[PDB]
Amino acid sequence: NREEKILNREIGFAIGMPVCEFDMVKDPEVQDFRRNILNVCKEAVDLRDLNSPHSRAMYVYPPNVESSPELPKHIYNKLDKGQIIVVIWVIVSPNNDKQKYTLKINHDCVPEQVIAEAIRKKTRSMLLSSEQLKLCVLEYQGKYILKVCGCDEYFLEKYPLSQYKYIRSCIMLGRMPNLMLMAKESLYSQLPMDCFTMPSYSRRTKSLWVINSALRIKILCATYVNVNIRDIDKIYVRTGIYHGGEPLCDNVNTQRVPCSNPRWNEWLNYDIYIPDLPRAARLCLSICSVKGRKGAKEEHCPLAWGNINLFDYTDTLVSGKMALNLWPVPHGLEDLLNPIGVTGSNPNKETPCLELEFDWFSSVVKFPDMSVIEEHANWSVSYSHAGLSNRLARDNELRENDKEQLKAISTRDPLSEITEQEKDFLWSHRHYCVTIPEILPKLLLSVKWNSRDEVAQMYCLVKDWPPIKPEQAMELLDCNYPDPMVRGFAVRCLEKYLTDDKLSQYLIQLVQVLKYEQYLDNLLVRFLLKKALTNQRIGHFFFWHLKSEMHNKTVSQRFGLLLESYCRACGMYLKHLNRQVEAMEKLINLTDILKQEKKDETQKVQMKFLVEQMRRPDFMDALQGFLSPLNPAHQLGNLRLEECRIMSSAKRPLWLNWENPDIMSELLFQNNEIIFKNGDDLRQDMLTLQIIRIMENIWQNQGLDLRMLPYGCLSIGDCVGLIEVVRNSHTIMQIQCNSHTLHQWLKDKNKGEIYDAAIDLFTRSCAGYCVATFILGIGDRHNSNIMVKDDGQLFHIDFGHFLDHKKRERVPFVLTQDFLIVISKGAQECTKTREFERFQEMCYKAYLAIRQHANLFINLFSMMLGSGMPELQSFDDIAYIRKTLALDKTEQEALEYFMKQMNDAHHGGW
Ligand SMILES: CC(C)n1nc(-c2ccc3oc(N)nc3c2)c2c(N)ncnc21
Fold first, then answer.
1. What is the superkingdom listed in this entry's lineage?
2. Is the distance from the beta carbon of residue 798 to the nearest atom of ligand 1 less than 6 Å?
3. 799 C-alpha vs ligand 1 centroid, how far in Å?
4. How far is CA 521 from the centre of its chain?
5. Which residue in 726, 858, 748, 861 sits closest to 795, CA to CA?
6. If you take atom 19 of ligand 1, which residue's CA is the nearest one?
């Protein structure tokens, strides 16, 4: 009633469009999705109310843990005899006195064991309780919970203390962990119980295989096809039947008609049997122009494109009259068709519009049930009769060379081209493939999707297919794998083997591949929403990754509806997301005014305006007392306007400073510094920074302490976003204030016995960033986009473009004598040193480690193909890292290559 209205108003502000606009959408798929997705909402809420309050605190404050408890060789070695020193703080009776208790405990100690040990140290003063009954009422560890001093991170689950990301970091960085003992009932009360309500909208035949006919589609007429008559001669419609990025038959064009009258009334006949149409078959079309000639070949140009699914969300083969509002052709489209393009009708109806008719076979035609599929697969299942086609291998036919040949095929990278000889081979030996389940993505590409008999066989193999690694399953979710039985299996592996640490790690890819789903209601959307609604850390980024694309009409309906369902069931977080949403709004409206009206003024004038505009009551209210969209465990107190400045950088970003309202702010950072950028697409920087974190985690799990700085970066909208500020760090140029200038500065900041640890950090971070940038083909490095910390850690900022920004593999990070003098610790011939010898083997061991995990990076890039990212628009883009990692070459041939690239850029040494 009145409360539904408030909520409707609250969701409307969060997603950026009124809920009422979803109610007017006549599409049954839309209204069904809104109503039918509500069971995920119910289930998620029920799980939160299972063991209240704890159950609800786990949702709000989930454990920030690593996937594996096992501490690597070098990490366990930082512990003194396998024991970690921790500092526990108690806020005692006001004037809120902070009292510390320093403890030495095993790294595998559970938080409850730590609370007891802290109470044991605290009570030690009263020696009466020390000897007699050391217990102290079971040391009431159920009356207290651990919190991270300085931020809203809690230790609520029975995990070894070292498995917690904060504690593992503290071990690696040589920092003492400061924890705060906070009474259980004080957190539990701060949590308002959820009152999830069901919305008002929540109330409201023949089989395909019996149609012994060829497919046909009628192409009627086109409107809103406004064309300069003087240029174009004729216009025709190019059409094709696809399954993902692969055609099921040959592409059929209509007759050419004068552009003044786009009227065809033609029935287009295709090279495909109707029972032979796979589930994910789609019609792909475009309106093309043709003018010439100069006595040469005809100048074909695609005007606008569109794709329709041959079957609707209810498995119904689309029948009857239709209208498709076409889409503009994106720059550099090498084809007349756009199969990898978004499927569906353009929301703007003032765009070219193709009117079609599909066949009507006297009744509602539907895709057969699995019972009919299995009964046509068991129905599918001599010496010279099993050998009349290279797609059948009988019993007593499996060779030991074949077993190793299939094994060799499985090793090959995702972009490694399977030959047609190799496809017939994988298909004939499909039943052995179950022994090495990792072969599935290659085997699935060996299927002739245009054959019902072949596809039905594949469907049965997928049914009883051994689950694969979560990282391995993610490929089966890219554009290449449209089939629901395939994608459903991939979701099933993630549903089972994917940790919440890894879901947070790969969330952007998982949000992206959603655009490759045929329907609004699928197993991926349900998987992701459930995780978003049972973990508020995942939930936060699901919301922001989806909100940041609401300006993109290609996805705004899917995403809008997904955000509607999310906002109804997230609970209290909605009020906090709304605060962030309003904060970001005010920074966009303000940075817009500066860019449009005041760009041509002095820093002094611009700052005067900034300060005046920020001091306004409506502004001050919105921009203080909210959670950092970058890390929502960060409270952003009051603005420190005296520390807020417009940066001299390009797009003139705002450096913003907030107080940290935590009582233990001083034990983390007393002030939160975020950079607000308006003007650049922050999406490439999110992907690079994600890849850097992954490369770093790989090296750290092999015994390579090559420290990276994957700083926070979050795209919050259309070329607007947030950048984390790396505290106490300076660019190479702001160190030059000769050749020893850098080494001089580092040696100065790190004087004494702290010098030998600061040198190692430079050389190790340098080796990591040197290997990372080469492989990735990041934008060329200079004195301004290389930064150094007052401890020794080197890192890069502003990545620009990845892969081939040129359009024949570069070394973007070339080492100046400065960096090499720090490595060789002042040495004259920095080439022939014992220090550079230890640095060479760092770069070599780093490069080979990434080579081993090539298939993950290739996959993480392919999932991101859906994104409008100009440097990631084709599989020919991702192809770059297949060159840098020398995947065709051997492990020794690849090492020689890396040395040659470094040598032909640094002019020797290696
Ligand atoms: C040069 C100096 C002021 N500085 N600049 C940045 C910075 C600014 C914008 C960016 O856009 C992207 N993509 N990466 C960026 C990095 C920065 C930081 N993140 N931490 C510390 N100092 C920093």
1. Eukaryota
2. yes
3. 10
4. 21
5. 726
6. 725
**Which DSSP symbol is given to 656?**
E
Instruction: Name the residue at shortest CA distance from atom 23 of ligand 1.
Output: 725
Cα–Cα distance measured from residue 765 to residue 104, given in angstroms and rounded to the nearest whole number: 30
Instruction: Give yes or no for a contact between 712 and 630, defined as CB atoms under 8 angstroms apart.
Output: yes
**206-366 fold:** Immunoglobulin-like (2.60.40)
Q: Are 864 and 393 in contact (CB under 8 A)?
A: no
- As for the chain, the residues directly before each break of C–N over 2.5 Å are 204, 381, 737, 807
Give distance in angstroms: CA of 793 to centre of ligand 1. 15
CA distances to 97, 130, 160, 488, 786 from 100, rounded to whole Å, are 10, 19, 22, 52, 39
The angle that helices 484-497 and 523-534 make with each other, rounded to 10 degrees, is: 20
Cα separation, 624 vs 583, whole angstroms: 8
Q: Determine the distance separating the centroid of ligand 1 and the alpha carbon of 720, expressed in angstroms.
A: 15
For the CA of 711, the closest atom of ligand 1 is: 19
CB of 25 closer than 6 angstroms to any ligand 1 atom: no
What the block records as the tokens of 16 is 């950026």
Quote the tokens at residue 124. Answer: 């030690």
The residue whose CA has the least distance to atom 11 of ligand 1 is 798
CA of 798 to the centre of ligand 1 (A): 7
730 lines ligand 1 (CB under 6 A): no
Distance CA 409, CA 422 (A): 8
Sequence-separated (6 or more) residues with CB below 8 Å from residue 2:
none
Closest-CA residue, ligand 1 atom 18, reads 725
370-576: CATH, from 3.50.50.60, 3.40.50.20, 1.25.40.70, 2.40.40.20: 1.25.40.70
> Obtained via which technique?
X-ray
